Amino acid sequence: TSFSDSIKQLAAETLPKYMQQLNSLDAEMLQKNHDQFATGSGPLRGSITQCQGLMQFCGGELQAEASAILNTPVCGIPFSQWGTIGGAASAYVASGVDLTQAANEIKGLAQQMQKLLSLM
Containing H/E element for 39?
none
Are the C-beta atoms of residues 74 and 105 closer than 8 Å to each other?
yes
Experimental method: X-ray
51's CB contacts (< 8 A; 6+ apart) are 11, 66, 69, 70, 80, 113, 116
Alpha carbon 101 to its chain's center: 15
Are the C-beta atoms of residues 109 and 72 closer than 8 Å to each other?
yes
Alpha carbon 2 to its chain's center: 25
Domains of the chain: 1-119 (1.20.120.260)
Return d(Cα 10, Cα 93) in angstroms, integer. 30
Resolution in A: 2.2
Torsion sign, CA atoms 59, 15, 84, 92: positive
